[PDB]
Design a protein around this ligand. Structure first.
Ligand code: HEM
Length: 418
């Protein structure tokens, strides 16, 4: 039984956590049919994430060629290979350093007003329909929209552009699936051309007429260090930033709305102070990792042993983040949605000192973790207040993803009771 196929099967597509429990206890260092390993326990996942750099290296040109055989020499794989997620130290260390110099907590906090503004407008667009007793696919009208509009504000782009780029991301990703046709490959390569041309023009525009967005800050001079991302590095950083926030953030919003509706007694957390709202959102992340797996390959630098299981040099190791979040050794009563686990603590850290894994750990820790958290911290209380009697209208329809717990629809309506 291949654990990657077992987790994509329809028998475990709705609730995969019983199978994950089985893995943790019976096959915690699972070797798949492809030879790729999958770690399901919190302890082994934590170790492997923090070892990335010493025990594990990033994917080589040969690794990516094996992982993407149909796109080995494509423009699209070359663009993905250039992203921070696919790099390793010390190159990864400079690039991370340079984007975090300007992609700061202050920068992100300055987006909170836009987050509320977008949420008010989008909810206002559907207020009448909900008031008339109708059903709304909240995923399509809100969850996918808010993250892209916030990216547009962040980068200094138009709404039209970000929605066109998202489509290009869709095409490129379809072009990199292992079963992708020649036609999808060609379509992907043209889109990659499109995306590179767009960012080159966006870079040049902000350089001559800088504004207050992140791209302007990134392309202008800095007082302290004269180091900066070259144009090629900039194109790749902005592309990878968008890829990192594509689907993931929308899924996190969907999951948070679904947790509000399934556990109405927990919506009190969204009505409290900042610390209270953050606690709810941390538990949303622990209860259902929007990203089930790691997509960053982690390659053994030598013959590794976890227990008596050998992971040979050059082997690819992935981690089941969602399973570690439900590991009772790290989170007691793991199947209970309880925001108190993270009330008053540092982000991602439980009151018992255990970290949730939804964002990773170590040197590839999600660059956008704060951006995602702030988007939910601002939009969720606004949703909860505007529609107190919001209820699930039907079963959400899950969207098949290799490693994300995405939704195609999240149908909601207002409770009709005289
Ligand atoms: C709910 C939303 C998100 C989740 C659950 C998530 C999850 C993750 C995880 C688990 C990793 C590391 C995976 C590994 O180490 O194998 C990662 C990396 C990354 N994420 Fe996110 N992410 C989210 C949203 C975002 C956003 C909004 C951005 C915008 C900047 C972003 C940008 C990145 C980047 C650039 C990396 C690579 C960092 C590096 O390799 O140094 N992600 N994400």
């Amino acid at each position: 039984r291949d654990a990657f196929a077992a987790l994509a099967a329809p028998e475990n597509n709705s609730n995969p956590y019983e199978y994950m429990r089985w893995l943790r206890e019976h096959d915690p260092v699972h070797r798949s049919a492809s030879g790729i390993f999958l770690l399901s326990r919190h302890a082994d996942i934590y170790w492997a994430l923090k070892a990335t750099g010493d025990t594990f290296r990033g994917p080589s040109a040969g690794d990516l060629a094996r992982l993407f055989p149909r796109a080995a020499i494509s423009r699209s794989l070359n663009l993905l290979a250039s992203t921070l997620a696919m790099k390793e130290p010390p190159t990864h260390t400079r690039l991370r350093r340079l984007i975090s110099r300007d992609f700061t907590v202050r920068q992100i906090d300055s987006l909170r007003p836009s987050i509320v503004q977008v949420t008010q407008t989008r909810l206002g667009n559907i207020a009448s329909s909900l008031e008339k007793g109708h059903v709304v696919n909240l995923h399509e009208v809100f969850s996918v929209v808010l993250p892209m509009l916030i990216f547009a504000e962040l980068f200094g782009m138009t709404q039209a552009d970000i929605f066109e780029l998202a489509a290009s991301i869709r095409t490129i990703l379809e072009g990199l699936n292992p079963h992708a046709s020649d036609e999808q490959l060609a379509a992907s390569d043209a889109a990659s051309l499109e995306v590179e041309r767009y960012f080159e023009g966006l870079i040049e525009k902000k350089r001559r007429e800088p504004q207050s967005d992140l791209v302007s800050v990134l392309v202008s001079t800095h007082d302290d260090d004269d180091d900066k991302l070259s144009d090629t590095e900039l194109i790749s950083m902005l592309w990878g930033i968008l890829l990192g926030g594509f689907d993931t953030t929308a899924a996190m919003i969907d999951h948070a709305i679904l947790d509000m509706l399934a556990f109405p007694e927990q919506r009190r957390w969204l009505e409290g102070d900042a610390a209270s709202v953050k606690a709810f959102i941390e538990e949303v992340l622990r209860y259902d990792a929007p990203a089930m797996f790691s997509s960053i390959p982690r390659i053994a630098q030598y013959d590794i042993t976890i227990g008596d299981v050998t992971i040979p040099e050059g082997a690819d190791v992935r981690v089941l983040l969602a399973s570690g979040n439900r590991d009772p050794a790290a989170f007691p009563d793991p199947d209970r949605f309880d925001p108190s686990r993270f009330h008053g603590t540092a982000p991602g850290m439980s009151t018992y000192g255990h970290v949730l894994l939804s964002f990773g750990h170590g040197i590839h820790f999600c660059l956008g973790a704060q951006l995602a958290r702030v988007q939910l911290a601002e939009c969720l209380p606004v949703i909860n207040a505007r529609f107190p009697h919001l209820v699930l209208a039907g079963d959400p329809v899950r969207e098949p993803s290799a490693f994300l717990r995405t939704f195609r629809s999240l149908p909601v309506r207002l409770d009709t009771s005289g």
